[PDB]
Amino acid sequence: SWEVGCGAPVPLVKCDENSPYRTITGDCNNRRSPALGAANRALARWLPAEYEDGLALPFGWTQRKTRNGFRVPLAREVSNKIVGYLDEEGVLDQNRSLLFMQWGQIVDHDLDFAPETELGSNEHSKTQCEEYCIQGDNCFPIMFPKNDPKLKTQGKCMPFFRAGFVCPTPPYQSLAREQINAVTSFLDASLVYGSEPSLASRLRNLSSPLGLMAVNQEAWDHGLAYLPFNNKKPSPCEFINTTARVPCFLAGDFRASEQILLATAHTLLLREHNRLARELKKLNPHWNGEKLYQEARKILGAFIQIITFRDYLPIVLGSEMQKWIPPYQGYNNSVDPRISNVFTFAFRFGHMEVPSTVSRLDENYQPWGPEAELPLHTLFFNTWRIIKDGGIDPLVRGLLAKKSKLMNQDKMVTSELRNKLFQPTHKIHGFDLAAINLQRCRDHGMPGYNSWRGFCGLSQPKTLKGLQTVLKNKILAKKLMDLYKTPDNIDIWIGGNAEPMVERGRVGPLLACLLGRQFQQIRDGDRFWWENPGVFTEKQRDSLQKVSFSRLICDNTHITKVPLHAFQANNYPHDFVDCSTVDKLDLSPWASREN
Ligand code: HEM
Ligand SMILES: *[C@@H]1O[C@H](CO)[C@@H](O[C@@H]2O[C@H](CO)[C@@H](O[C@@H]3O[C@H](CO)[C@@H](O)[C@H](O)[C@@H]3O)[C@H](O)[C@H]2NC(C)=O)[C@H](O)[C@H]1NC(C)=O
Ligand SMILES: *[C@@H]1O[C@H](CO)[C@@H](O[C@@H]2O[C@H](CO)[C@@H](O[C@H]3O[C@H](CO)[C@@H](O)[C@H](O)[C@@H]3O)[C@H](O)[C@H]2NC(C)=O)[C@H](O)[C@H]1NC(C)=O
Ligand SMILES: *[C@@H]1O[C@H](CO)[C@@H](O[C@@H]2O[C@H](CO)[C@@H](O[C@H]3O[C@H](CO)[C@@H](O)[C@H](O)[C@@H]3O)[C@H](O)[C@H]2NC(C)=O)[C@H](O)[C@H]1NC(C)=O
Ligand SMILES: *[C@@H]1O[C@H](CO)[C@@H](O[C@H]2O[C@H](CO)[C@@H](O)[C@H](O)[C@H]2NC(C)=O)[C@H](O)[C@H]1NC(C)=O
Ligand SMILES: [Ca+2]
Numbered sequence: 001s002w003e004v005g006c007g008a009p010v011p012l013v014k015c016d017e018n019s020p021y022r023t024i025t026g027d028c029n030n031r032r033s034p035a036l037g038a039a040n041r042a043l044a045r046w047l048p049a050e051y052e053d054g055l056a057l058p059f060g061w062t063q064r065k066t067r068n069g070f071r072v073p074l075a076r077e078v079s080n081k082i083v084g085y086l087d088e089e090g091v092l093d094q095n096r097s098l099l100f101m102q103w104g105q106i107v108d109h110d111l112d113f114a115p116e117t118e119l120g121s122n123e124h125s126k127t128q129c130e131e132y133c134i135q136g137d138n139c140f141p142i143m144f145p146k147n148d149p150k151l152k153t154q155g156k157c158m159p160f161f162r163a164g165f166v167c168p169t170p171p172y173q174s175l176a177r178e179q180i181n182a183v184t185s186f187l188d189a190s191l192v193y194g195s196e197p198s199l200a201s202r203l204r205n206l207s208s209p210l211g212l213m214a215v216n217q218e219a220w221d222h223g224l225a226y227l228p229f230n231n232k233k234p235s236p237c238e239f240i241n242t243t244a245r246v247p248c249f250l251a252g253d254f255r256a257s258e259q260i261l262l263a264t265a266h267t268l269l270l271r272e273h274n275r276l277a278r279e280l281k282k283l284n285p286h287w288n289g290e291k292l293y294q295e296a297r298k299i300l301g302a303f304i305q306i307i308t309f310r311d312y313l314p315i316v317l318g319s320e321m322q323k324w325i326p327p328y329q330g331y332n333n334s335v336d337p338r339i340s341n342v343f344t345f346a347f348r349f350g351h352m353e354v355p356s357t358v359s360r361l362d363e364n365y366q367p368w369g370p371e372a373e374l375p376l377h378t379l380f381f382n383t384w385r386i387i388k389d390g391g392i393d394p395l396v397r398g399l400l401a402k403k404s405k406l407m408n409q410d411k412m413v414t415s416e417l418r419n420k421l422f423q424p425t426h427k428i429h430g431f432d433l434a435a436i437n438l439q440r441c442r443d444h445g446m447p448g449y450n451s452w453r454g455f456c457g458l459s460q461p462k463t464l465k466g467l468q469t470v471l472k473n474k475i476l477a478k479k480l481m482d483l484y485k486t487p488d489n490i491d492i493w494i495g496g497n498a499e500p501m502v503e504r505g506r507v508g509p510l511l512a513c514l515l516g517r518q519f520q521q522i523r524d525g526d527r528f529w530w531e532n533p534g535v536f537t538e539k540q541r542d543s544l545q546k547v548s549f550s551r552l553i554c555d556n557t558h559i560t561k562v563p564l565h566a567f568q569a570n571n572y573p574h575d576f577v578d579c580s581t582v583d584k585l586d587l588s589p590w591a592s593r594e595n
Helices: 075-083 098-111 125-132 197-203 260-283 289-312 314-324 343-352 393-401 433-443 449-455 464-471 474-484 492-498 509-524 540-544 549-556
Strands: 092-097 357-359 373-375 403-405 429-431
Touching: 075 433, 075 474, 075 492, 092 098, 092 393, 098 260, 098 289, 098 343, 098 393, 098 403, 260 289, 260 393, 260 549, 289 314, 289 509, 289 540, 289 549, 314 509, 343 433, 343 492, 343 509, 357 393, 429 433, 433 492, 449 492, 449 509, 464 474, 474 492, 492 509
Parallel strands: none
Antiparallel strands: 092 403, 357 373
């Protein structure tokens, strides 16, 4: 007897239904189906979940339970044998700036977050999990395979805690397990403003009727603002350097300080808000704080949607853009906003675009200081390098002048992420993002590689030879078969990323399809999509079609030399122009007048 729906977390909201602005939680976007796309609800399922016991257990959880007749290789084993590489020479992307990779994480953070199980309120089950590699309940450690170097130095496994699921955080069983999406599915700047009420209201500066976002009161960037500091027992950022004592930042999204270039882009967007809110007071001295806040917030979301859809997607996707994301024909309330569960893994193609180093550049876009270039892995949860070493201006230049890493079937994920990842409660710079991606692929009950090739109307290889043909790599196909034994068993993250990139894109056909369908949905299914008639006026959409990431930098930094097209590889000074040459955002259409 099928069910209409599940009822634990949700004190329900009324909906204004006259309302102009999006809610903070995403609720009320779809009038006939309120909760669609709202934070803290189940990630949507495009295909039924596939677990080892049909309900919630991990393929690979029980030694004896095979997937289609074969054991399901250890995540860290797939990582070692396939994902890793030694030589960082030549892996750079000749036609994608480092911003390409960065916007990707930004957009991704705007769309989805599946935390680990809230059941962690003064327990040792985390330390027991950590210490003796005892699998049980939500502790699902990543076991090291034999001959794994980390055995000589780290122990027998790597922490890992299953994702939050719906209708509790403790006991459940009776139907298939569904993981939670803690942020709104809409492209709406929830990473800047937040997805709950605590949080939004508290990022805000309410002492002054100007609708500013609260800023750091304890540090300045040559007169420019920094996000406020955070508040936890264990701040990660402090932990990585106990002498410096610099806290992580407080943003609408939780992960803001995971890495220094992500905190940088966050710092960037928070300035755009206050800049808009300030130019909005100058233009409208009567508008109160909430009106300034909400209309700045409106505009910021529109900027994110445009840079993403106009500049970003066309070059992830390439020749498949026009197959999945056609010209926008208007708000369609029949579409499902919801970020699917598989998309949260598909969008992880970004992990293969992160290079091994990050640079600080000075005004002439030459090395800044004596330790200009830094090992990626020393910048996890690193805020001190920003506050007490130059601000964001040198880092933003590197985002423009340096390049992204290029996905390469023989060099997938840099060791800075594959062996040196820092996670916020554990002590070492010794984790593996690729192994975690795979373990999480199964924690979430993802169907295999062929289930998705089928979903996308693509062939489903059954033999080495077939897979060779699809991967266009004999040796990669070989290692996969040796590891998984049937194309059927290949985890979607790695199978999806094993495919050669499409014409003029950076993902293969399978991911082009998975990503292409989702972005089409979050656009068409948004009542507040910026280009939907009503949302913005006649002259309002005209001023907005002029925004660019180059202008965002120009207005929120003291940089004055930027590329016109920030996402392609840009070389200084030839590919760089002066800020005066770049179109500004004309706020004149926001003018309401009265008597
Ligand atoms: C450090 C990390 C990064 C940079 C140095 C980084 C970068 C990205 C980019 C460039 C992405 C897409 C364009 C992207 C996507 C998603 N990530 Fe990733 N990422 C770093 C680290 C992490 C870690 C840690 C996680 C959590 C892993 C887990 O399963 O526990 C992570 C996840 C994701 C993810 C799913 C988010 C969610 O929906 O839960 C992406 C879409 N990344 N990252
Ligand atoms: C919320 O908004 C208020 C008002 O904008 C913020 O206070 C204002 O902050 C500015 C810059 O931080 C201050 O300007 C200058 O202060 C320095 C040193 O304190 C001084 O040398 C100058 O005289 C100059 O005024 C200013 O004091 C202050 N303005 C007012 C009217 O109070 C406040 O910081 C914001 N709160 C948060 C949490 O962001
Ligand atoms: C480096 O990458 C550049 C971006 O991927 C690429 O330039 C792009 O060329 C394509 C091919 O005509 C154009 O495609 C876009 O055309 C217009 C946009 O002007 C849109 O209406 C279409 O939907 C489509 O997205 C672009 O004009 C152009 N990209 C940009 C941002 O201008 C270069 O060819 C690459 N450089 C090298 C040396 O290979
Ligand atoms: C933890 O953070 C420390 C900062 O709180 C950092 O120490 C600082 O490192 C800088 C280099 O970035 C040193 O400054 C350099 O340049 C200045 C120029 O004025 C010179 O005075 C110095 O001789 C030096 O060449 C600072 O000396 C130093 N500051 C302090 C208070 O020690 C640590 O390196 C960080 N440790 C880790 C593990 O990240
Ligand atoms: C709004 O969105 C829906 C998607 O849910 C679109 O739907 C359709 O396209 C076909 C028209 O050629 C219809 O025959 C199908 O019923 C439908 N397909 C799917 C997957 O829904 C369509 O653009 C809009 N729907 C309506 C009713 O206008
Ligand atoms: Ca969102």
